[PDB]
RNA sequence: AAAAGCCAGCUUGACUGCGAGAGCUACAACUCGAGCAGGUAGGAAACUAGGACUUAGUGAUCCGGUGGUACCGCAUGGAAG
RNA sequence: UAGCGAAAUUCCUUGUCGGGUAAGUUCCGACCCGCACGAAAGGCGUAAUGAUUUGGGCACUGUCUCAACGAGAGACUCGGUGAAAUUUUAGUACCUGUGAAGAUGCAGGUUACCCGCGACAGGACGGAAAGACCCCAUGGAGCUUUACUGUAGUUUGAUAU
RNA sequence: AACUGUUUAUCAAAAACACAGCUCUCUGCUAAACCGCAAGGUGAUGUAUAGGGGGUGACGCCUGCCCGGUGCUGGAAGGU
RNA sequence: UCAAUGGUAGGAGAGCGUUCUUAACCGCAAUGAAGGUAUACCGUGAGGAGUGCUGGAGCGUUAAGAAGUGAGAAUGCCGGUAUGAGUAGCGCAAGAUAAGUGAGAAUCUUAUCCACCGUAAGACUAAGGUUUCCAGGGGAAGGCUCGUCCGCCCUGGGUUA
RNA sequence: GUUCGGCAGUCAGACUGCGAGUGCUAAGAUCCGUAGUCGAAAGGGAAACAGCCCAGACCAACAGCUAAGGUCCCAAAAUAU
RNA sequence: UAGCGGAGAAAUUCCAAACGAACUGGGAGAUAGCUGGUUCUCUCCGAAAUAGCUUUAGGGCUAGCGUCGAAAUGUAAGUGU
RNA sequence: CAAAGUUAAUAAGGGCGCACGGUGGAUGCCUUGGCACUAAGAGCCGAUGAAGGACGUGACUAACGACGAUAUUCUAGGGGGAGCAGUAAGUACGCAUUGAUCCCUAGGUCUCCGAAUGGGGAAACCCAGCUGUUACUAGCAGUUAUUCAUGAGUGAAUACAUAGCUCAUGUAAAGGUAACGCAGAGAACUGAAACAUCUAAGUACCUGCAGGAAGAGAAAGUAAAAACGAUUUCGUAAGUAGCGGCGAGCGAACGCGAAGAAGGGCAAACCAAGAAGCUUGCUUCUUGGGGUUGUAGGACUGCAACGUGGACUUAAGCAUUAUAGUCGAAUAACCUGGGAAGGUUAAUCAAAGAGGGUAAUAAUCCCGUAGACAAAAUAGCGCUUAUACCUAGCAGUAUCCUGAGUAGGGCUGGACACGCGAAAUCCAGUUUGAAUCCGGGAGGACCAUCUCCCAACCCUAAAUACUCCUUAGUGACCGAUAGUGAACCAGUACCGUGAGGGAAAGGUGAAAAGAACCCCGAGAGGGGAGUGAAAUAGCACCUGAAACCGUGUGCCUACAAGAAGUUCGAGCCCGUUAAUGGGUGAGAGCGUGCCUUUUGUAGAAUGAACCGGCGAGUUACGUUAUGAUGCGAGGUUAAGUUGAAGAGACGGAGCCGUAGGGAAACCGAGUCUGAAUAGGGCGACUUAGUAUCAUGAUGUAGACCCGAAACCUAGUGACCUAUCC
């Protein structure tokens, strides 16, 4: 019962190379720094999985204060004025709104005005 | 191993020294005689042609405890214990010891 | 075992400085001498078990057999020759088809007996060939009509 | 200090067989002990008494003694043990 | 006891003094406080003898002031020929910190066209050497003894001969 | 340190070893001593100027004291 | 619906994959088995098949049993390939030209000079070596490079008392 | 929670306070009790940080809200009152 | 002249590129409280680093500390306030 | 004019991803090899020249093989029937259905060495003597080792004798040996947590003695009551009784169950013969009867012929097996392909559909297979036959016999479970030493009663142990790192002086059909042609990764200081297990490799060159726990027998539970403790297990592996070197 498995062991290796496949050099041309190399690569992408959430975030709020400070306004009462504000307490697709809306930008940013008013 | 102490039972006292003359007499229970009835000469042969116990200590002893269904005199023993002899011999038994 | 199959009993140089590691020998199993480490062995494998869960696991498939109907009760049907033509044409005289055990007398029919196994189906038996290995393997038999005393008689 | 302190008389309970109940905790140990029996000992009786005001003052099993021993006593008795 | 004594012996301490020496813990000679000299474990002497050990001097002198020169071999340029040790892979800088308490790779900050080539050694706690120092193992060897057990051997006595 | 010799080849040549010398002690012979179970043999075809062991290491001077203890030797009274 | 789901040594449960399993069940296979290769599918995972290609004989199913049974890692081993690196070395002495040789000459052969050793780096002879000698032919490796040359190789002779 | 049964490993930890001891009331020093932390628990904060503070992660997600801590630029929020 | 040995102008010197105990084969895969190594996938739960003894202190044996199963739930013990 | 600002690809190279290369031979398959193991045999050979070498022998010039100057074979027999001319090419004379080659059996010769032996001698040697031969300062053929035994002769000191010597006869017998045995001699390491007792084990080794087995054995036995009746093996008792620094461990027997189941001689006593201490009556020897003993038996008085390995395991027939082999059934087409046995269509067979070949999987193609025949010689086995020869019962008891340094006793040992102990009992050394049938011994010190037996004399099959071997074979053996070190010219090469060690490597294609030719090339090698199904198929050749080196390829990079990453993404390029496509990737955010150990390692703590292959928690037996199943106070067959290494069935011997208390006497659902019937202690109250399986853990086994320095035994070694001659 001396047996091997010979291939299915080769094919564990032939699986997590070509799932391994991509990075720089000569890491496909040998073994074990391929196998965390797509292993802490998605460590972080469980992190970014998490932090390009937390730093779009900082994309939305960081250029809404950029048409906010474009309307001379800062982000922290032009939020309290969103508290303040309607229904809408609507963040982030009002964060996509730099795309040419003077009226849905400018027009909500009066309408926070007349929330802190 | 208590660590190199000697162990619990390495401080025991040497206690009884042991009869080689020691024998009993594979002793049943009164309930198997209320299994059979009344199997005239209760011995030996009912005993182990009963199949009770097959290998035994050479005589055959019963219980006080196991109950008086049984209505022969002549039980053909080694030695049945007194209490025994109460109950059976109470009940419509006779003695033939050895 | 590297003890049992050998050359070397010997270590073959020492460590210090020498390069390698603390090591045993090419006897020791790690280099083509290979010495198995627990492996197999000369062993066997039987058991037999108790009568009354035997003669109950042959009244299992008995049973199966019984509602099953695959069992047919046949007579003697003792030929002259033992030529495979009378057992092809009785055999496949009903045809079970896939795998069929033959139930003989106990004592021991042999004409398709002493023939019959280049017949590929057919099962040569009596009352002395009882297993589960015997049954459940054809599942499909014919049957020597005195299997009262071929069957009841300890089952 | 109702003395555990001190002094006199009795005095040999610093009894036997225990021991519920406990405490302490690896175990081994260890700390007590209600109460009962068998008789006791003081004390008129009641009452007290299983060492000392409590706590050091002590060690595991073996092995060989000392005595008793309804025990066994290697077929059988005894004896040896 | 003789006799030698800062001994191949005094760490007692650069003992003391004198000589060599301008410069003199070392050297010699005496002193001798001899921790702890020392008599057959010879002691004190002792020419010749020493690949001795020191201390001094003469001689000669690139050792050095302080170096320089040329000759040959490698080196190095090419043709042929062509290995070893070596290792997680790495397109591998600097500072200051931090941290199994000393950074290439980390944080901050600095400078850096890309790739070489000839020489050099500060790192890469460079290799090569499962520390030979120390410690531990109920580790083993070897050695010693008035350890304990023995053994042979040596020597009594009995007793068959 | 006398000397010459010898000395760790894979470190060390020396004051280390050795050496004549000197000292003591043991052995009367089938030696002592030694090797081997013994046998056999060395010692040596040796006979105390010889053989064995111990010290020291030419030559010159000198080798002092202490037998309490140890060991050794010898003796036997008694103890064991 | 509510509650739970960090987790090492720890403990429990469950499942995957390999091979053999006479079992059967039940097929595939030259129109292509296995195996390899690319693959931009699926499966919580392990894992599974689809296609393209190599390839030309056994393999797959299912379910269950049985196991030398699930691979990085130990100075693990064996086998291959790096690396350093076209770098070290090219193993203590000087040849030179012309001509031949060949296909190809530095290194083969000759001529002619030079040079060296010469109490040897001569000749002869122990042990040793065990045919290495010579002749002819050849150049797979060997010659530390080349190489027509050779103690290399093939063939043949060669030692006489 | 107890009981019973298997099956374990753990023996040597630190650190932060807080209260002790020893020490120059030296120490990232020892040695206790006491809680946490790590170990064996990510993320955020403090420039990186195992131990301090906050906050315990099944997973997706281009959701929001918030802990401490921050809001002149890197580097997001207050040239906030 | 051969390893419990030998040789020895004696250092612990040598006994075939080599010795405080040679080399070869077997015992014997000697042993090793010490080093290293350990291979498929998931889920759930989840540590200790301490006491006591110990020729014991870098190790064991209990006990404290996990896990699973079973028997009831001391009729609630547990755990809070 | 200019002034600013801006972005560019051209990449020496490099990276990504892709394509195709070589390179390496894992893969994947095969298996002529090896392992284990069953059944049946054989289990020894040899001086009447062994084992084992060395050397030769072939028309080829090798080497192996095989044989032995006759030499790559010869005789004789018998089978056998077409080619032969081992290996294999490779050649030649040839040779051959007349019957070869070949197979078997028997005989022949048998180089040298070697037990090796005429004598010496290092292995393949030298030198002889004698007897005939035949010729020569030849040659041939034989004899000539030793010890033992047996004779014969000889005959010293010293007369006989004796020692001693000489000759002759007898392989005897020396020697080689697979494993098992027996007997002697006999450790250590270990473990005991160290270790001096123990253990390891009387095992490792070593020496001797033997056969197919060995020992083994016929009560001077066990036991304890009616109790049987030599042994041996297995199961049981059962780790039970015991012993033991009572630690750690070691360890029974009895009885029972199964197999196997055979006992028989002698001395003694006596009786007869002889010869002789003939010192007469001899009281020693030789021959033959006598009879081999336990409830004594024989001798003395009585008195019976039973086959017999046992009261002759001789010879003659019978029968059959190894030893040569022989016959031996049952089919065609189509499709595919290079090829059918594959698919398809049909048919047959039947004691043969085991298995293997065949270009690709066969029952009908072949070998075969099942069955059925065959051996002269061949080695046997077995049956029948008279013979191959020694035994019986029996009553009584004149006295004798019956196993002398023997039992015993002392001491020192050892074995027996037994470690000196209460120590049995046996066997050693040493010493002392009986009785003898009215006897003597055993009954775990020993003294009486009882039970049993008769030593101190010898042989004994059978059941058992193990295989180098001979086949018949079998595999949930194994597939070229495996499987024997060794599938291959393996114990090879090679190392070492030696003892020793000890490798690597199989596959073309079906078939070499092995690439004619032509061209390049000094040659090789290539390239065309052609070969074959295929030439990436071309001689280490199936399949071909992997590291390494490449060559091409779309994108990007020569203001960059990263565990080399994600995530987003400008821009570019391409279009896919048709998919919210892929290949990129500037730029930008955030990001300390993996392993053991640790309190904490990112590490300047280890370790890893890489790649591939191998490469480590088992089982044997036992216990415990948990479940599963079965039956249940009833569960349970072990060993063994049967049988296909089947199954089933038999086999109840034994084992577990079915009450315990107390050391024990004993008592008993109670029991012990204690004056207690006081209390306490354990107890049914306190309620089912058994058996098997399976899993975890356990314990003896190297017991999860890798690991020393070590210990002892056996053997080798003085050419290095030291000494010495």
């Known amino acids: 019962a001396r047996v091997k498995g010979s291939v299915a062991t080769r094919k564990r290796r032939k699986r997590i190379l070509k799932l391994a496949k991509g990075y720089y050099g000569a890491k496909h041309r040998l073994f074990k720094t391929a196998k965390e190399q797509v292993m802490n690569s998605y460590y972080y992408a469980f992190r970014d999985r998490r932090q390009k959430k937390r730093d779009f975030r900082k994309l939305w709020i960081a250029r809404i204060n950029a048409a906010a400070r474009m309307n001379g306004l800062s982000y922290s009462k032009l939020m309290h004025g969103l508290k303040l504000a309607d229904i809408e307490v609507n963040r982030k697709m009002l964060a996509d709104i730099a795309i040419a809306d003077a009226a849905a930008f400018t027009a909500l940013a009066e309408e926070a005005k007349k929330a802190l008013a | 191993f208590e660590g190199g102490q000697t162990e619990l039972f390495r401080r025991m006292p040497k206690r009884g020294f042991l009869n080689v003359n020691r024998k009993e007499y594979a002793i049943v229970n009164l309930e198997t005689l209320n299994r059979l009835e009344d199997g005239a000469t209760v011995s030996a042969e009912t005993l182990v042609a009963a199949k009770i116990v097959k290998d035994v200590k050479s005589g055959v002893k019963v219980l006080a405890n196991g109950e008086l269904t049984a209505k022969n005199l002549t039980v053909k023993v080694a030695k049945v214990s007194a209490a025994a002899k109460a109950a059976i011999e109470a009940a419509g038994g006779s003695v033939e010891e050895a | ?155």
Not at chain 3, 42 to 64: D, E, F, G, I, N
Not at chain 3, 86 to 100: D, G, M, P, T, Y
């Open chain 3, 1 to 155: 075992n590297r003890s049992a199959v050998s050359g070397g009993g010997k270590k073959p140089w020492r460590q210090k400085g020498t390069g390698r590691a603390r090591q045993g020998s090419t006897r020791s199993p790690q280099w083509r001498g290979g010495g198995t480490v627990f492996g197999p062995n000369p062993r066997s494998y039987a058991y037999k078990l108790p009568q009354k869960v035997r003669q109950l696991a042959l009244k299992s498939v008995y049973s199966t057999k019984v509602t099953d109907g695959k069992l047919i009760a046949v007579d003697t049907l003792d030929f002259a020759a033992p030529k495979t033509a009378e057992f092809a044409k009785v055999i496949s005289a009903l045809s079970i088809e896939r795998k069929v055990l033959v139930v003989l007398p106990n004592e021991g029919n042999e004409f398709a007996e002493l023939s019959a196994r280049n017949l590929e189906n057919v099962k040569v038996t009596t009352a002395n060939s009882a297993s589960v290995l015997d049954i459940v393997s054809a599942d499909k038999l014919l049957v020597v009509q005195s299997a009262l005393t071929q069957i009841e008689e300890v089952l």
